[PDB]
Design a protein around this ligand. Structure first.
Ligand SMILES: Nc1nc2c(ncn2[C@@H]2O[C@H](COP(=O)(O)OP(=O)(O)OP(=O)(O)O)[C@@H](O)[C@H]2O)c(=O)[nH]1
Lengths: 58, 160, 142, 52, 51, 141, 58, 241, 175, 155, 49, 52, 154, 30, 163, 110, 41
RNA sequence: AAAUAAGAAAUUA
C-alpha cells in the first residue's frame, strides 16, 4: 500500500454501490400493502488501483 | 452559521394554528413568500388544486431560489466598493504580481514577507489613496486626503 | 381492472389509489383541458409563447387520402370557421364536430373547446350498481 | 540513529524555488521517524554532516 | 442600480491597458462561446445548497 | 385479481346527445367567456379599497401625518391612476423611496382576497357577494 | 459578472422588497437540467457503467 | 418647533432645526457637548432612496407615459446622511475650524443583524435580531470620522465581578430574583465562573446569560451540598441518640 | 460472539444466506497478525489512535508547508485547512496579554505566599505516584495566530471550493 | 477488582495537542476536539473556526454541556484552548441538544488523552459513555417516511 | 492476563496492574515470598504505588 | 394497531434500552466529592473538642 | 403580533404535558422571564415551574422507585397528591403567561390573533380578517376594514 | 454504589411550606 | 472487456461504446515550462503573457497547470489533434502581451466608496449659495404660511411639472 | 406568541413611562401580578383530576379529548380554589399598595 | 421487544444450525450484524 | 396512528 515500500503500489478506490428499492408484493388492490413490502438490495462493485510510475517510456 | 430556516416543512396531516404549531403556508414563513405557494380554503381534492403547490421537490426548489436571493442580496449590501480596472503600472506594489483566478489556486496571502497575511481577493483600497491614479485630469484633488491618528500622541486613552 | 372499457382492462392493475411522481401519471387524461379563465385565456393550456408556430397538426404533411378526425392539439384558425369544411375531433363516445363556427374559438386548441367529462351521463352504459352509486353522489335522479 | 550515510548537501538560495542539491557528503543520521504522521511527504532525515 | 454598462477603449486611457471585456471576447472566440445578450445582471445566484 | 367484466354497449342515440350537449356547452361557454372578460376588465378599470393594513405601522399614524403626508402631496396622482390595486400600489411605494426598506419588512398589507374588494366596501360579507357566474378567479367585482 | 458594454442593466437588489415585488415567477412544471435529464429522475438514476462515483479521469 | 397641530409641525420643524443649528454654531463662549450614539450611522447613507424622478413629473395615464414606476420596483441611489439637514448642521460645526466651543463625545453601534455567508429566513417567533439594523457593511472609525477614536473592550474580571454581583444581589434585594427559592440556584462563585465562560465577559452577554441562568440543567452544586448537609444532620442525630 | 473474534476483513457477508463466511475457507489469523509485533492495542503505530495520527500528521505537514511547492499538485498541494485559514485571519494576529487579575494572582502567590501556581499539566494527580513532568508542560506559548483555529467565513468558502475544483490538476510526471 | 482504566497521555510532543471524538445519531454528528493547554490563562473554545457562543447561538443550556468536562475534572476551563471540527453531516446550525451532547463527548475524550487521571471522574459522571440512538431509517411504507403506518379500514 | 483481543485491551493498563499486584502482595505473609512477586512487577513494567 | 387494542406499555421493549447505565441518571458533581469528604473529616475533629 | 388567524385552543394539561419540547423549552421560558422582569415583577411561578421541570428532565430516563403493595394505598395517594400539586403550580404559570401577554399587548398597541380577549380593549374576542365573515362566537357581522382597538397616532 | 443522586424517576423536586386546599376545589363539569 | 462482452456479436458494439465513452484526452502543461527562452531569445511566456493566459483560460488553469480536456470527437486520435490545436491557439492569443502594454490585462482593484471623512463634506457643498438662498426661501415660506396651514417644499424650492 | 420584537417594544414603553413619571400602569401590573401569583396550596389526599373511564369508547375515539376539554372548560381560573386569591389573603412576599413602592420614597423619609 | 418476539425470533446473537436462506427469510440480515453501533476506540 | 434521538410512568396470565 505504501509507495516507499513497493513498486508498483496500490491505492484504494471507493466502491460503486447502488441501492435498489422495490415492491415485493404483487397486489392489484392496495397501494398501502405494496409500500409496506419494500425490499432493499444492493448492487456492488469493488475497486483497487495499481500505480506504476516509470522514469522512461517502454 | 445562520439560524434561519432553509428547508420547507414536509406535507402531513393539515397543521392548524395552535400553541406550538402554525399552518404550513402561513404568512409568517419565508418572509411571507408562502403566498406564492398557497391554495386557500378547504380544497376540494377531486375537482380543485394546483398540483405543484403540494409537490415536495418543486416546492423545495422554489424555497431554495428564495434563500439564494436572500444571501445574494445580503452579500451585495455588504459591499462598499466597485471594481475598477487599473493598468498594471499604476497599481500598488502588492498587486504587481500574478493573481490566479477565483477557485483556481490556494486562497492567497497579500504580503507574507511584510507580515500581512490576508486574502488579496478581499483587500479593499481607499478612493483617496488612488486619487492621483483615478482622476489625473482634475488638477486639484477632488477628495481631501484622509486624516490619520497619531498612535504615539498623548491622548485621553493613554491616561494623559 | 374491474371493468374493461378497452383492451387494457385485461392487462392493467389499478393498485388501489396509488401515487405517481409529479406530473407523470401513466395515462394522460386531461379533464381540466376545458377549464374557463378570462384573465388566463391566452396562457392556460396553450403555447407558452405567442411567437411559437402552430403545431405539426395544423398542416397537411404528406400525400393524404383524407382523415377521419383531426387531432385535438390542432389549433382553431379563422379558416376553420370561414371555410365551412368538416372539422371533427375524437372524443367519447365517438366524435365531436364543430358545426357552429365562431370567432371566439380562434387561437385556442380544440382540447380547450371539447368538454372531456360531460355533465351528461348515459344510463345505458351503467350497470344497475353503478347507477346506484351515481344516485348516491347526487348525480342521477332517483 | 548512528547510521553512516552519504547525503546530498542542501544549498540555500532565496533565488531558488523548490530546492538546490549539491554533491553527496559523509554524514550521520541523528533521527529518522518511521511513522508517517511524524514524517509526512516528502520524507525527511535529520542528519549531521561530518565536515563542519 | 439601473445603469448603462460601459467600456473605455484603451486608446482613450492615460495609460493603455487591456480591458477585461475585450479579453472576454478573445476567450469567446477561442472556446466558441455563446454570449447571452439578454442575461439579466441582477440574477447572479449561486446554488447555495451545493456550493 | 378477477377477470374484468365486459363493459355494456354505448347507448342508442347517445352519439347525437353527446354531440348536441358538447355543441351547446361550447356555445354557452362563448358567452360565459365574453361576460367574464367584461368583468375582468371592469375590475381592472375600477377602484379598490386601500391595500395597506392600518392596524400596523407606518399606517396606523393619523391621516394628517407621516406616510399619509407623503401620500397626499407626492404620490396621490399615481396612487389614483392605478386604482389602488394592491400590486401597483406596493410597487409605487417601493419606487417613492422615501419609506425605503420598510414596505415589505415593517409595513403590513391586507390579505389578497380582502385587498380585492371594491372601494366603498363596508361589511366583510362583500367577499362572498361577488358574482359566481363569471370565471375571473376572484379578479371580478 | 461581465456584461455587454452599452446595454442598460440592473444590479442585484439590496432591498428585500425589490426582490419580493418584482415579476420573478415560481417553478411550476417539472424541472429540467441539460446534463441530468439523461439520468431520468433522482429515483431512476441511470448509470451506463458501474464506475466508482469517485473515479478520476486520467 | 414642536408645538403645533400636524401637518403644520412638519414644515415648522424643518425651519426650526435649520435655525437651531445656525444658532448653536454662532455661540462661541458657552461650552456645548454633543453626544450622539451611533455616529457611524450618520457617516454613511440613510436607508432612504431618492424618489424616482417620475414622481416629480406628473402623469396622464400609466398606459403610455413611457413609465415603469407601477410595473417594476427599482433601487435609486441612497440618500447620504450628510444630506439630512440636522446632520448637515453638525458636520458644519465639525468641519469648519474656528469653533473650539464644541465637543463631540460620540459613539458607534454594531447592533446589525448577523450575516455569515448564508442566510435563511429568520423564524419570526424566535428572533433576537428583529429590531436590529440591516447593514452588513464594515465601519472604521479612523477613516470614517473626524473624531479621535477610543477603543472599548469587554469587561476585565474586576469590572465583570462587580457588575455581576450587582445584577444578582441587588436584583434579589429588589424582589426580582430567586427569592424564597434561592436554594435552587447555585452559589455566587459558581454562577460567576460559569457566566464568565458563557458570556466571554461581554457586558450584553453577561446581562443576557444572567437571565438565562434560570434554565441551567447541568449544574450539580446545590444537589451535592444538600446531600452532604443531610448526611451530617443524620450523623448528628445518631450521636445525640 | 456469533463467530470467532478476529479482524473482520476475514469475513464476507454471504450471498443468499444470512450469515458471514471466511474468505479463506476456515483458516483464521488472530488479531496479533494484523498489527506490528507487540503493537499497543493492535495499532499500526503505538503513539496515537487513528484520529490522533491524522491531526498530528496535518500539523507536521503544515509546519513544513511552503506555497511555492504546491504547484502541480492537486489537493495534496493545499495546506492544512484550519491552520492556514487561521493564519490568513488578521483579527487573530493580535493575541491578548495575560489579564491583569491573572498576572496579579499569580504574582501574589509566588512572591507574597512562596508557592508558584502550577499549570494543570505540572500538577501531580496520582495519589500513589510521582510522574515526570511532560516536556511541553509550561513551554508552548499562546498565539491566536497559531491556535485555536479561528477564521473568516469568506476565506473558508473559497478554500473549500478551490480544493474541490483542483482534484485533477496534478502534474504526475515531474523531474 | 480493576476499577477504571488509567492510561498514559497521548499528546503531540511538539504542539502539545490531544485529540478526542464525539458522536450522536451514529451519522449526523461526528466531532473532533483538538485540545491544548493555554499558559496565558485566556483559553477559548472555537467550533469550525467560529467562537462557541456564536455556534451554539448563545443558548446557555447547550454551552454548559461543553463546560461540564472541565468541571467534572476539577479544572479551570481558561487553562485550555479548544477547537472542535465537524466531521459528520454539515448543517447551517448545529445549535440543538443532540449536537451539544456529541460536542461534550469530544471535549471529554480529548481532555482524557491530555490529563490521563482525569479519566476517572469523567468516566463516573458518564461523559465518556456513548449512547447509541438513531432516527429510524426512512422507509416508504410509513406516511411520514419514519414512524406512522397508513390508514386502516375494516373491509 | 496479556490482552489478546481489542476488547481485552480495553480492560488493561500498567497502572491498574499495580492494584492487582498490590493485592497479591498483601496476600503473602512472609517477606521472601513477596520479593519474588515484586521482582516480577518491577521487571514487566508495572506502575508502582 | 388495526381494529385491535393497543398493547400495555410494558409490552414494548425498553424506551431507553439504547442509552448506557452511566447516563441514567448522570452522576455529575464529581468535583465536589473530595471537597465534602475533607469537610466532613474536619467536622469530626471539631466534634471531639466539644466532648474531650 | 404577526400571527393573526383564528386558532385552536388546547386544554392546559396537554400543553404542560409537552414538557421540554414546548412548555418547558428553555428558549421559550427565558423570554417569558424577560417579559416579567422588564415589567418589574418577580417571576415566582415561572421559577417554580422551571425547578419542577428542570428536575423532570434530569431523571427522565430512569425507572420509577419499586412499589411495595399496600391495602392502605397511602403511597399511591401521596404520589398522586404531589403530582396534582405540581400540575397546579404549572396551571398557575400557564395562566400568568396568557394573562400578562394579553395585558402587555394591550400596552403595545398589538392586535391579537383572531377571537382573543384583551381585557381593557376587546372584551368579547377581537377579530379582523377572518376566513369567515361574521365574528365566530357572537354570530355578529364583521365590519370592513378590520376593527381598530387603538387611537391612530404612533 | 457510594452516594448516588436519586436513581429513580418521579422524585420530589420542589417542596414548600404551604396550607392545605379545601376538599374538592374542582367543579365537576360538562 | 475481458468478461462477457469479450467474444460474440455484441463484442463489437460494446467495444466501440467504451471507446466513445472514453474519447476524452486530457492535455496538461505547467506554466513553469512555458517560461523559457524562445528560438528568438525572447522569453516565450513572461509575467504579462502569463496573466493574459490565465484570464483567457479561466477554470482551465489550476495549481499553475493548464489543462484542456478534449472531448469533441469520438476517437482519441482526433481529440489529441483538437486539443493540441486549441492549446496553440490559446498560446497564440496569450502571447499578444509581448506586443506592448495595450495588451497587458488590467488589474481589478476593489476601490472603496469615498470614506466617512469625505462624505462629511457633502453637507458643505455650495455652502455660501445655499445659505444665501435659504434666506430667500425663508421669506417665501413666511409668506406662503399666511395663506395655508401646511407649506410643502413643493411650494418653495422643489419643482414638479404639472402637465 | 410573545416575540423578542414585543420585548423590545416593551422595554421602550417601560422606559418612556418611567421618564414621564407615570406610575399608574406599573401599579395595575403590580396588582394583577400580586393577585394571580400567590402560592397554590397542597391538595388534600383523595383529590385528583378525573380521568376518562375505560371500557366506554375504544382507545382511538374522540370522546377521550372531548372529555378533557369539557373538564378544563368548566374549571376556569376563576373557579380555581386551590390558589388563594382575595382581599382576605395575607401576602408575605409582596408589597400591599402603591405607598410601599420605591417611587413613593419621599414619604418613607423621616 | 416483548410485543414482537414471535417475529424477532432470529434477531439476537443466535448460534445457528442451519442458517436461514433468502427463500425462507425475507428481511433478516444475519446474526453478526450491528444496526446501532457505538463508537469504540 | 405512535412507547425505536428523544423527553409520556403504575390496576399481568
Ligand atoms: N451599568 C453599566 N452597565 C453597562 C455598562 N456597559 C454595558 N452595560 C450593560 O450591558 C449592556 C451592553 O449594551 P450596550 O452598552 O447598549 O452595547 P453597545 O456597546 O452599545 O453595543 P451596540 O449598540 O450593540 O453596538 C447595556 O445595556 C448595559 O445594561 C456600563 O459601563 N455600566
Amino acid at each position: 500500500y505504501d509507495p516507499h515500500t513497493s513498486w508498483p503500489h496500490v491505492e484504494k478506490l471507493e466502491p460503486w454501490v447502488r441501492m435498489a428499492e422495490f415492491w415485493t408484493s404483487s397486489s392489484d388492490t392496495s397501494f398501502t400493502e405494496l409500500e409496506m413490502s419494500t425490499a432493499h438490495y444492493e448492487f456492488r462493485k469493488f475497486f483497487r488501483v495499481i500505480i506504476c510510475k516509470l522514469p522512461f517510456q517502454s | 452559521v445562520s439560524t434561519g430556516e432553509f428547508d420547507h416543512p414536509p406535507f402531513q396531516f393539515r397543521q392548524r394554528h395552535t400553541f406550538n404549531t402554525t399552518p404550513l403556508h402561513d404568512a409568517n414563513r419565508f418572509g411571507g413568500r408562502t403566498a406564492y405557494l398557497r391554495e386557500i380554503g378547504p380544497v376540494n381534492i377531486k375537482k380543485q388544486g394546483r398540483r405543484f403547490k403540494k409537490d415536495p421537490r418543486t416546492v423545495q426548489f422554489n424555497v431554495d431560489v428564495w434563500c439564494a436571493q436572500q444571501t445574494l442580496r445580503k452579500r451585495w449590501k455588504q459591499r462598499d466598493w466597485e471594481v475598477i480596472e487599473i493598468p498594471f503600472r499604476l497599481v500598488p506594489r502588492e498587486q504587481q504580481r500574478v493573481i490566479p483566478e477565483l477557485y483556481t489556486d490556494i486562497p492567497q496571502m497579500t504580503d507574507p514577507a511584510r507580515n500581512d497575511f490576508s486574502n488579496i481577493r478581499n483587500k479593499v483600497y481607499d478612493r483617496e489613496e488612488l486619487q492621483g491614479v483615478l482622476f489625473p485630469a482634475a488638477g486639484a484633488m477632488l477628495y481631501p486626503p484622509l486624516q490619520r491618528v497619531d498612535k504615539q500622541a498623548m491622548t485621553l486613552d493613554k491616561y494623559l | 381492472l374491474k371493468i374493461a372499457k378497452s383492451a387494457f382492462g385485461f392487462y392493467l392493475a389499478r393498485r388501489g389509489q396509488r401515487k405517481y411522481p409529479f406530473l407523470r401519471r401513466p395515462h394522460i387524461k386531461n379533464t381540466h383541458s376545458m377549464n374557463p379563465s378570462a384573465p388566463y385565456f391566452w396562457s392556460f393550456m396553450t403555447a407558452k409563447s405567442q411567437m411559437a408556430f402552430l403545431p405539426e397538426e395544423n398542416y397537411i404533411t404528406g400525400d393524404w387520402t383524407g382523415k377521419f378526425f383531426v387531432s385535438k392539439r390542432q389549433v382553431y384558425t379563422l379558416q376553420h370557421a370561414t371555410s365551412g369544411a368538416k372539422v371533427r375531433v375524437k372524443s367519447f363516445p365517438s366524435i365531436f364536430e364543430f358545426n357552429s363556427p365562431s370567432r371566439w374559438n380562434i387561437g385556442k386548441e380544440m382540447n380547450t373547446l371539447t368538454k372531456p367529462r360531460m355533465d351528461l351521463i348515459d344510463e345505458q352504459m351503467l350497470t344497475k350498481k353503478q347507477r346506484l352509486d351515481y344516485v348516491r353522489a347526487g348525480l342521477l335522479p332517483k | 540513529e548512528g547510521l553512516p550515510v552519504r547525503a546530498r548537501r542542501p544549498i540555500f538560495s532565496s533565488s531558488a524555488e523548490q530546492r538546490i542539491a549539491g554533491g553527496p557528503q559523509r554524514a550521520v543520521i541523528i533521527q529518522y521517524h518511521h511513522q508517517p504522521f511524524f514524517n509526512p511527504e516528502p520524507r525527511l532525515v535529520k542528519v549531521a554532516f561530518q565536515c563542519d | 442600480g439601473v445603469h448603462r454598462v460601459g467600456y473605455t477603449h484603451p486608446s482613450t486611457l492615460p495609460v493603455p491597458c487591456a480591458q477585461r471585456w475585450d479579453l472576454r471576447l478573445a476567450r469567446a472566440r477561442i472556446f466558441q462561446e455563446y454570449i447571452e445578450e439578454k442575461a439579466p445582471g441582477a440574477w447572479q445566484l449561486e446554488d447555495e445548497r451545493s456550493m | 385479481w378477477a377477470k374484468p367484466k365486459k363493459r355494456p354497449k354505448v347507448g342508442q342515440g347517445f352519439h347525437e346527445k353527446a354531440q348536441k350537449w358538447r355543441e351547446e356547452y361550447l356555445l354557452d361557454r362563448h358567452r360565459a367567456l365574453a361576460d367574464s372578460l367584461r368583468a375582468y376588465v371592469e375590475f381592472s378599470t375600477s377602484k379598490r379599497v386601500e391595500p395597506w393594513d392600518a392596524r400596523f405601522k407606518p399606517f396606523d399614524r393619523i391621516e394628517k401625518d407621516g406616510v399619509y403626508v407623503l401620500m397626499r402631496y407626492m404620490m396621490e396622482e399615481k396612487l389614483q391612476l392605478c386604482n389602488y390595486h394592491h400590486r401597483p400600489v406596493k410597487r409605487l411605494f417601493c419606487n417613492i423611496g422615501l419609506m425605503g426598506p420598510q414596505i415589505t419588512t415593517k409595513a403590513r398589507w391586507k390579505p389578497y382576497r380582502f385587498a380585492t374588494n371594491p372601494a366603498g366596501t363596508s361589511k366583510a360579507e362583500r367577499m362572498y357577494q361577488r358574482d359566481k357566474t363569471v370565471y375571473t378567479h376572484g379578479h371580478n367585482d | 459578472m461581465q456584461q455587454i458594454p452599452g446595454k442598460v442593466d440592473q444590479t442585484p437588489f439590496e432591498e428585500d422588497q425589490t426582490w419580493l415585488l418584482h415579476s420573478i415567477p415560481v417553478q411550476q412544471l417539472e424541472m429540467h437540467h441539460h446534463e441530468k435529464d439523461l439520468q431520468d429522475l433522482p429515483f431512476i438514476n441511470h448509470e451506463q457503467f458501474p464506475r466508482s462515483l469517485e473515479w478520476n479521469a486520467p | 418647533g414642536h408645538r403645533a397641530v400636524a401637518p403644520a409641525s412638519i414644515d415648522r420643524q424643518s425651519v426650526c432645526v435649520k435655525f437651531l443649528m445656525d444658532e448653536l454654531s454662532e455661540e462661541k463662549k458657552l461650552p456645548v457637548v454633543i453626544v450622539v450614539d451611533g455616529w457611524n450611522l450618520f457617516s454613511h447613507e440613510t436607508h432612504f432612496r431618492y424618489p424616482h424622478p417620475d414622481f416629480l413629473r406628473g402623469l396622464a395615464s400609466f398606459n403610455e407615459s413611457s413609465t415603469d414606476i407601477d410595473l417594476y420596483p427599482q433601487e435609486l441611489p441612497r440618500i447620504p446622511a450628510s444630506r439630512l439637514s440636522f446632520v448637515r448642521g453638525l458636520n458644519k460645526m465639525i468641519l469648519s475650524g474656528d469653533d473650539p466651543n464644541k465637543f463631540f463625545i460620540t459613539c458607534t453601534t454594531r447592533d446589525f443583524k448577523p450575516f455569515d455567508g448564508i442566510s435563511g429566513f429568520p423564524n419570526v417567533e424566535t428572533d433576537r435580531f428583529a429590531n436590529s439594523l440591516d447593514e452588513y457593511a464594515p465601519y472604521d472609525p479612523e477613516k470614517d470620522s473626524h473624531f479621535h477614536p477610543i477603543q472599548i473592550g469587554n469587561f476585565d474580571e474586576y469590572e465583570y465581578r462587580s457588575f455581576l454581583r450587582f445584577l444578582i444581589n441587588s436584583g434579589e434585594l429588589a424582589g426580582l430574583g430567586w427569592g424564597p427559592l434561592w436554594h435552587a440556584s447555585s452559589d455566587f462563585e459558581r454562577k460567576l465562573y460559569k457566566i464568565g465562560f458563557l458570556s466571554g465577559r461581554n457586558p450584553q452577554g453577561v446581562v443576557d446569560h444572567y437571565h438565562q441562568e434560570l434554565v441551567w440543567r447541568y449544574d450539580y452544586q446545590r444537589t451535592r451540598q444538600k446531600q452532604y448537609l443531610l448526611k451530617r444532620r443524620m450523623e448528628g442525630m445518631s450521636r445525640g441518640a | 460472539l456469533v463467530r470467532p473474534d478476529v479482524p473482520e476483513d476475514q469475513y464476507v457477508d454471504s450471498w443468499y444466506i444470512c450469515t458471514s463466511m471466511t474468505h479463506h475457507m476456515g483458516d483464521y489469523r488472530p488479531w496479533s497478525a494484523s498489527a506490528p509485533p507487540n503493537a499497543f492495542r493492535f495499532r499500526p503505530f503505538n503513539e496515537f489512535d487513528a484520529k490522533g495520527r491524522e491531526y498530528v500528521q496535518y500539523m507536521r505537514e503544515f509546519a513544513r508547508f511552503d506555497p511555492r511547492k504546491s504547484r502541480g499538485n492537486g489537493q495534496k498541494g493545499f495546506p492544512f485547512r484550519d491552520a492556514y485559514l487561521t493564519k490568513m485571519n488578521e483579527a487573530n494576529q493580535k493575541t491578548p496579554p495575560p489579564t491583569l487579575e491573572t498576572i496579579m494572582d499569580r504574582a501574589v502567590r509566588e512572591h507574597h505566599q512562596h508557592a508558584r501556581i502550577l499549570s494543570p499539566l505540572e500538577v501531580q494527580r496520582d495519589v500513589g505516584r510521582l510522574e515526570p513532568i511532560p516536556s511541553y508542560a509550561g513551554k508552548i506559548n499562546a498565539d491566536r495566530s497559531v491556535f485555536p483555529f479561528q477564521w473568516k467565513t469568506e476565506d473558508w468558502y473559497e478554500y473549500e471550493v478551490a480544493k474541490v475544483r483542483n482534484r485533477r490538476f496534478v502534474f504526475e510526471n515531474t523531474e | 477488582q480493576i476499577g477504571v482504566r488509567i492510561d498514559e497521555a497521548e499528546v503531540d510532543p511538539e504542539t502539545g495537542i490531544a485529540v478526542g471524538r464525539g458522536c450522536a445519531d451514529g451519522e449526523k454528528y461526528h466531532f473532533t476536539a483538538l485540545l491544548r493547554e493555554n499558559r496565558d490563562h485566556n483559553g477559548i473554545i472555537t467550533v469550525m473556526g467560529k467562537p462557541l457562543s456564536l455556534v451554539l447561538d448563545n443558548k446557555a443550556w447547550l454551552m454548559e454541556m461543553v463546560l461540564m468536562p472541565f468541571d467534572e475534572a476539577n479544572l479551570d476551563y481558561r487553562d485550555f484552548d479548544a477547537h472542535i471540527v465537524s466531521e459528520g453531516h454539515a448543517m447551517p446550525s448545529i445549535a440543538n441538544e443532540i449536537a451539544a451532547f456529541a460536542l461534550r463527548m469530544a471535549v471529554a475524550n480529548a481532555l482524557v488523552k491530555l490529563i490521563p487521571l482525569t479519566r476517572i471522574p469523567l468516566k463516573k459522571s458518564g461523559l465518556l459513555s456513548v449512547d447509541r440512538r438513531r432516527e429510524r431509517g426512512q422507509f416508504p411504507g410509513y406516511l411520514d417516511g419514519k414512524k406512522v403506518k397508513r390508514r386502516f379500514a375494516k373491509r | 492476563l496479556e490482552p489478546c483481543t481489542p476488547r481485552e485491551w480495553l480492560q488493561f493498563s500498567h497502572r491498574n496492574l499495580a492494584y492487582a499486584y498490590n493485592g497479591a502482595l498483601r496476600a503473602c505473609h512472609s517477606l521472601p515470598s513477596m520479593l519474588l512477586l515484586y521482582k516480577e512487577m518491577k521487571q514487566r513494567g508495572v506502575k508502582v504505588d | 394497531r388495526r381494529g385491535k387494542p393497543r398493547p400495555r406499555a410494558g409490552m414494548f421493549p425498553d424506551k431507553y434500552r439504547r442509552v448506557p447505565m452511566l447516563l441514567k441518571p448522570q452522576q455529575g458533581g464529581q468535583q465536589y466529592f473530595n471537597h465534602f469528604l475533607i469537610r466532613s473529616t474536619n467536622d469530626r475533629l471539631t466534634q471531639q473538642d466539644v466532648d474531650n | 403580533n404577526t400571527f393573526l388567524t383564528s386558532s385552536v385552543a388546547t386544554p392546559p394539561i396537554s400543553v404542560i404535558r409537552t414538557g421540554p419540547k414546548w412548555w418547558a423549552d428553555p428558549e421559550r421560558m427565558v423570554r417569558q422571564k424577560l417579559m416579567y422582569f422588564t415589567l418589574g415583577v418577580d417571576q415566582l411561578p415561572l421559577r417554580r415551574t422551571a425547578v419542577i421541570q428542570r428536575d423532570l428532565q434530569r431523571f427522565h430516563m430512569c425507572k420509577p422507585p419499586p412499589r411495595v403493595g399496600d391495602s392502605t394505598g397511602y403511597k399511591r395517594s401521596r404520589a398522586a397528591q404531589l403530582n396534582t400539586w405540581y400540575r397546579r403550580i404549572q396551571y398557575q404559570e400557564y395562566h400568568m403567561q396568557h394573562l400578562f401577554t394579553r395585558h402587555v399587548w394591550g400596552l403595545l398597541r398589538v392586535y391579537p390573533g383572531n377571537t382573543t380577549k384583551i381585557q381593557g380593549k376587546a372584551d368579547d374576542g377581537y377579530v379582523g380578517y377572518d376566513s369567515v365573515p361574521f365574528h365566530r362566537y357572537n354570530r355578529a357581522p364583521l365590519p370592513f376594514p378590520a376593527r381598530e382597538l387603538y387611537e391612530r397616532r404612533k | 454504589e457510594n452516594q448516588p443522586i436519586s436513581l429513580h424517576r418521579n422524585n420530589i423536586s420542589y417542596m414548600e411550606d404551604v396550607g392545605r386546599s379545601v376538599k374538592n376545589p374542582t367543579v365537576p363539569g360538562l | 472487456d475481458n468478461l462477457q462482452y469479450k467474444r460474440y456479436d455484441w463484442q463489437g458494439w460494446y467495444q466501440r461504446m467504451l471507446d466513445v465513452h472514453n474519447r476524452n484526452v486530457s492535455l496538461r502543461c505547467r506554466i513553469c515550462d512555458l517560461q523559457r527562452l524562445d528560438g528568438n531569445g525572447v522569453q516565450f511566456v513572461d509575467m504579462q503573457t502569463e496573466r493574459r493566459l490565465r484570464i483567457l483560460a479561466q477554470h482551465r488553469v489550476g495549481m499553475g497547470v493548464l489543462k484542456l480536456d478534449a472531448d469533441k470527437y469520438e476517437d482519441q486520435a482526433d481529440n489529441v489533434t483538437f486539443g493540441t490545436t486549441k492549446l496553440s491557439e490559446l498560446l497564440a492569443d496569450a502571447r499578444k502581451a509581448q506586443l506592448g502594454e495595450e495588451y497587458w490585462p488590467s488589474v481589478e482593484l476593489k476601490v472603496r466608496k469615498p470614506s466617512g471623512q469625505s462624505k462629511a463634506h457633502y453637507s458643505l457643498i455650495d455652502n455660501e449659495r445655499i445659505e444665501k438662498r435659504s434666506r430667500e426661501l425663508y421669506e417665501k415660506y413666511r409668506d406662503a404660511k399666511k395663506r395655508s396651514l401646511f407649506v410643502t417644499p413643493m411650494e418653495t424650492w422643489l419643482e414638479v411639472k404639472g402637465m | 406568541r410573545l416575540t423578542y420584537d414585543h420585548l423590545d417594544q416593551l422595554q421602550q414603553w417601560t422606559m418612556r413611562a418611567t421618564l414621564d413619571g407615570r406610575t399608574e400602569e406599573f401599579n395595575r401590573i403590580r396588582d394583577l401580578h400580586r393577585e394571580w401569583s400567590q402560592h397554590p396550596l397542597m391538595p388534600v389526599l383523595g383529590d385528583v383530576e378525573p380521568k376518562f373511564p375505560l371500557n366506554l369508547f375504544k382507545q382511538n375515539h374522540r370522546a377521550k379529548k372531548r372529555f378533557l376539554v369539557r373538564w378544563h372548560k368548566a374549571n376556569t381560573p376563576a373557579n380555581w380554589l386551590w390558589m388563594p386569591r382575595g382581599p382576605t389573603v395575607v401576602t408575605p412576599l409582596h408589597r400591599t399598595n402603591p405607598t410601599q413602592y420605591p417611587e413613593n420614597w419621599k414619604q418613607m423619609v423621616q | 421487544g416483548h410485543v414482537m418476539t414471535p417475529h424477532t425470533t432470529l434477531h439476537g446473537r443466535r448460534i445457528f444450525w442451519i442458517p436461514p436462506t433468502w427463500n425462507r427469510a425475507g428481511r433478516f440480515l444475519g446474526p453478526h450484524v450491528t444496526l446501532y453501533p457505538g463508537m469504540t476506540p
